[PDB]
Structure 1
Amino acid sequence: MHPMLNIAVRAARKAGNLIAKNYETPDANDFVTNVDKAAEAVIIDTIRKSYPQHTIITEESGELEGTDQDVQWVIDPLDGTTNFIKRLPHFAVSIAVRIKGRTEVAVVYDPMRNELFTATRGQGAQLNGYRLRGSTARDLDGTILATGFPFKAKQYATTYINIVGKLFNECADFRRTGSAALDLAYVAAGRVDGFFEIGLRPWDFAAGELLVREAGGIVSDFTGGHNYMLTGNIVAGNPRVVKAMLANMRDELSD
């Protein structure tokens, strides 16, 4: 848990350094993808030097294998890309290392605020030396929902709207900074009570789901199942609020 985490942390460090460096060339749709590729490539170099056996899984490069196919590196060098496209500073790098059909290492690093959340299965998820103890809410009273509008899954638009309508009738308020990984980190660190989003992808939540579960929370799909890994339908938070949310949101779904 020490060496893998140290390597991942150094990788996220280099990624965040390059990202923040390139964040100072003001321009007013492509160069964002260029620096994305560059950060992904220096991450790839970090993967090749240290442990050249593991395999890499990126939204961009798909999956690039080596010899140890049992150790997958799921590295999103940027989440909430549109923010960095608009200079809105809410974005992070999400490193994940899955071993034996299961996530084991997780890191989410915002270089702007310098937020470096780490997570090993079992021993838990730390932040800068602090332990994330989830949220204290037992229901949907006065709580905050890290809600995410499906700007890539417009098919479920109206369904999602009715769902969030019922929620806001029941719950208190939403938040959306346009960064799934950071949303998961925040709901993990008790900064926002509950979280739920539609149509996500493994390279996005790969680390955040572990960050949440290690914080006395759970991650599931809209039907309590465990296929949210690929169905992109995720609800997360400490179990009280997740139960209180599912009990209200089940009866207006379509999947």
Structure 2
Amino acid sequence: MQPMLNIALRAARSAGELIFRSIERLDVISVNEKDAKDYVTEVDRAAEQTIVAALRKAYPTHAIMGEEGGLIEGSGEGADYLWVIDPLDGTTNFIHGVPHFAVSIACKYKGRLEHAVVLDPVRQEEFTASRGRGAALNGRRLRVSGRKSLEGALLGTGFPFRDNQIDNLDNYLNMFRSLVGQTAGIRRAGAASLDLAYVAAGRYDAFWEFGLSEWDMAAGALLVQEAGGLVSDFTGSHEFLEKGHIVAGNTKCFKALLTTIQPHLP
């Protein structure tokens, strides 16, 4: 409804239609191990081109930070706007044909989250927010869940590394373990932007993950904030975008989750 948000939304829609046609072709004509990385890079960069063309047609002086393309500075007052783009969040899902992935676009004005779009092109779920305007899913206002504690909570999470990183891993599995008793479930769906959007819509009561990139978190974090939730890093501060670890939730479940993970950090 704000012109900048509408621009971002149409760019996400075009990218998502491209991604949807790609998955359709994938599902009938089956790429093998070696080709998978190259197919993903191709679809990623085609969707990013779609988005960036649409954005720059309206705001050519803005700064752009894409997953495929890196950081490109803006000029004049446009230098105060930074687009943070994951054109395809959930690439492993995508390349396997798992229908759970999103386009993720955030706009920051002087370093504050200003606009956000997370678009599931399969389910056709459009999560939007502007700073101080609240959040919507396909036009309906979003609210975080009301659950009062982790008792029976449904959490989201993820471990995005798939390396040797035995320190991190153990710590994570310790966090995970402490959460297993109270919660009704933990889900590992494979796209952090959709996990944050689901926190915002009330579908998850909270979410925690480390090892993320800015483009994975930016839009979904604004969604959670504007839906009435809380978002921070693992230490409780607001440097999640920079550090790559994030806790998001409704008020009570955010607080309980943060407390629960404290013993498994220094």
Smaller-chain TM-score range? over 0.9
Q: Which residue of 2 aligns with 1:52?
A: 60
| Cα distance, 1:169 vs structure 2 | 2.4
Which of 171, 179, 188 pairs up with 1:176?
A: 188
- Structure 1 unpaired stretches of 5+: none
Q: Which residue of 2 aligns with 1:192?
A: 204
**1:66 and 1:223, CA in 2 relative to 1: closer, same or farther beyond 3 A?**
closer
Contact residue 187 and residue 237 of structure 1 kept, 8 A: yes
Question: What whole-Å deviation, never above 9, does each CA across 1:194-228 have from its counterpart, x for those lacking one?
Answer: 11111111111110001001111010111111222
Which of 229, 235, 247 pairs up with 2:241?
A: 229
| Cα distance, 1:250 vs structure 2 | 0.6
Is 2:22 the counterpart of 1:22?
Answer: yes
SS in structure 2 at match of 1:170: coil
- Mapped to 1, the partners of 2:223 and 2:74 lie a distance apart of 27
Which of 40, 48, 56 pairs up with 2:48?
A: 40
Q: Which residue of 1 aligns with 2:255?
A: 243
- Mapped to 2, the partners of 1:2 and 1:176 lie a distance apart of 33
Give the TM-score normalised by structure 1: 0.96
Q: Quick one: which amino acid aligns to residue 34 of structure 1?
A: E
**1:24 and 1:161, CA in 2 relative to 1: closer, same or farther beyond 3 A?**
same
Which of 71, 80, 83 pairs up with 1:63?
A: 71
- Mapped to 2, the partners of 1:22 and 1:120 lie a distance apart of 30
Q: Which residue of 2 aligns with 1:166?
A: 178
| Cα distance, 1:61 vs structure 2 | 1.1
Is 2:90 the counterpart of 1:80?
Answer: yes
- Mapped to 1, the partners of 2:88 and 2:136 lie a distance apart of 21
- Mapped to 2, the partners of 1:10 and 1:79 lie a distance apart of 17
Question: What whole-Å deviation, never above 9, does each CA across 1:9-33 have from its counterpart, x for those lacking one?
Answer: 1101100111111112232311121
Residue identity over aligned pairs, in percent, reads 56
Per mean C-alpha deviation after superposition, the further-off stretch among 42-51 and 143-152 is 143-152
- Structure 2 unpaired stretches of 5+: none
Q: Quick one: which amino acid aligns to residue 157 of structure 1?
A: L
Instruction: Give the RMSD, CA atoms, in angstroms.
Output: 1.3
| Cα distance, 1:249 vs structure 2 | 1.7
**1:152 and 1:71, CA in 2 relative to 1: closer, same or farther beyond 3 A?**
farther
- Mapped to 2, the partners of 1:5 and 1:142 lie a distance apart of 36
Contact residue 102 and residue 121 of structure 2 kept, 8 A: yes
Contact residue 152 and residue 199 of structure 1 kept, 8 A: no
SS in structure 2 at match of 1:63: strand
Contact residue 119 and residue 127 of structure 2 kept, 8 A: yes
| Cα distance, 1:66 vs structure 2 | 2.9
| Cα distance, 1:130 vs structure 2 | 0.7
SS in structure 2 at match of 1:108: strand
Per mean C-alpha deviation after superposition, the further-off stretch among 20-29 and 196-205 is 20-29
Question: What whole-Å deviation, never above 9, does each CA across 1:157-206 have from its counterpart, x for those lacking one?
Answer: 00100110011123231011101000100011001111111111111111
- Mapped to 1, the partners of 2:237 and 2:59 lie a distance apart of 34
Contact residue 54 and residue 73 of structure 1 kept, 8 A: yes
Which structure 1 residue ranges, 4+ long, deviate > 4 Å from structure 2?
none
Q: Which residue of 1 aligns with 2:8?
A: 8
Q: Which residue of 1 aligns with 2:141?
A: 131
Contact residue 67 and residue 87 of structure 2 kept, 8 A: no
